[PDB]
């Protein structure tokens, strides 16, 4: 039947990525191996997400086989970096790698669902950019929320511009980037399950990522987002929900602006939050030159630390969820952060600042912003 040979590292890389994207019907425990010409295809489908990896292989005899994904994943990961021989004989797969020999039961290929077709390609960007942007924004998603809309990452496309956004009602993360568009007037706005997307961009890496939503009047119409690159491709179903309007929350200016060091603020938060009541909040008292970070109460413990701040405006006391705050700080990927305040229990805007009065102070334009709601003082 199907029998092929390829290096372990290639095989394992292909198999793991199918298993990282998959990750009901007992037939969906299997993964399909297909050998044609001089290439090996590894496919998995779960009806929500499909994943398929193509690699070079010595195909001694073309064909298809369906085996346990979990098991194949475990074995190919634990295999020495040697050539792997695979041979389908009867209703069993023999796998050989040096002195180690494996014999696995198969499942009938006829029962395996067909993997959905990818839409037409909509645009491409570097995988690294995609990975960074998506991990930046996904942190704000209401992953594991019971309200489907909050579980998505919004993707807005207009020509060469992509805007990514996510929210859980308490923080809102927005990332703008440039890509290579399939055409100058392509226009779309879709909503993509955040965890699936984050997982794809994570294993995405190679040089290019290509996004497939379709083209022309049919963009988004298939209800699928295709992601491909480096021999790999996947599909995820789009969320059928509308995303909140958010641009009206981004002020032209601020009543106060605070600029400081990201690394030291993150550590100081970790430190004072050690005594935070259920980790519910940390207080920040901004004034010229300094900010006092504090937490806790007298019954369990109090903690405070004064940090240097480049501060503009009148003194300001505002409190945050310490975890939401550090999530935002970690999403900046820059040395310094600015906080833009409108104050009066309105959100604070966190923007990335590079290492190198009276107001109001105009906002500075950035490709990333993390909008963070305060909490009320107890």
């Amino acid at each position: 039947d199907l029998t092929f040979r390829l290096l372990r590292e290639s095989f394992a890389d292909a198999v793991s990525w199918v298993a990282k994207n998959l990750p009901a019907v007992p037939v969906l425990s299997g993964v399909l191996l297909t050998g044609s010409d001089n290439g090996l295809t590894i496919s998995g489908f779960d009806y929500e997400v499909s994943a398929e990896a193509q690699v070079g292989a010595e195909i001694v005899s073309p064909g298809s086989v369906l085996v346990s994904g979990r098991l194949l994943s475990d074995i190919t990961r634990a295999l020495p970096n040697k050539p792997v021989d695979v041979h389908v004989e009867g209703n069993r797969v023999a796998l050989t790698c040096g002195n180690a020999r494996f014999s696995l039961p198969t499942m009938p290929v006829e029962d395996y669902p067909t993997l959905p077709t990818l839409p037409e390609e909509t645009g491409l960007l570097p995988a690294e950019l995609f990975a960074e942007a998506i991990s930046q924004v996904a942190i704000a998603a209401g992953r594991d929320d019971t309200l489907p809309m909050l579980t998505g990452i919004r993707v807005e496309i207009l020509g060469e511009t992509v805007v990514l956004a996510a929210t859980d009602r308490f923080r809102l993360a927005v990332r703008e980037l440039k890509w290579s568009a399939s055409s100058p007037d392509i226009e779309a706005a879709v909503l993509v399950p955040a965890k699936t997307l984050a997982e794809a961009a994570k294993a995405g890496g190679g040089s290019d990522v290509r996004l497939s939503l379709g083209t022309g009047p049919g963009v988004g119409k298939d209800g699928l987002l295709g992601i491909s690159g480096n021999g790999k491709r996947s599909t995820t179903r789009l969320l059928d929900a509308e995303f909140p309007k958010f641009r009206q929350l981004l002020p032209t200016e601020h009543t106060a602006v605070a600029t400081m060091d990201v690394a030291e603020l993150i550590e100081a938060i970790k430190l004072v939050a050690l005594v935070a009541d259920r980790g519910a909040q940390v207080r920040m008292e901004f004034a010229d030159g300094s900010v006092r970070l504090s937490a806790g109460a007298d019954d369990v413990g109090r903690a405070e630390e004064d940090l240097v701040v480049d501060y503009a405006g009148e003194p300001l006391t505002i409190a945050f969820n310490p975890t939401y705050l550090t999530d935002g700080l970690s999403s900046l990927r820059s040395e310094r952060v600015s906080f833009g305040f409108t104050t009066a229990g309105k959100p604070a805007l966190l923007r990335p600042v590079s290492g190198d009065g009276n107001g109001p102070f105009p906002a500075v334009s950035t490709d990333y912003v993390y909008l963070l709601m305060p909490v009320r003082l107890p």
């Binding site: 009602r169 809102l172 909140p244 929350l249 709601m373 909490v375 009320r376």
Partner: peptide
């Protein structure tokens, strides 16, 4: 714990 002033949303 107020939410963001998303309309609809809060």
């Amino acid at each position: 714990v107020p939410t963001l002033p998303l309309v609809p949303x809060g």
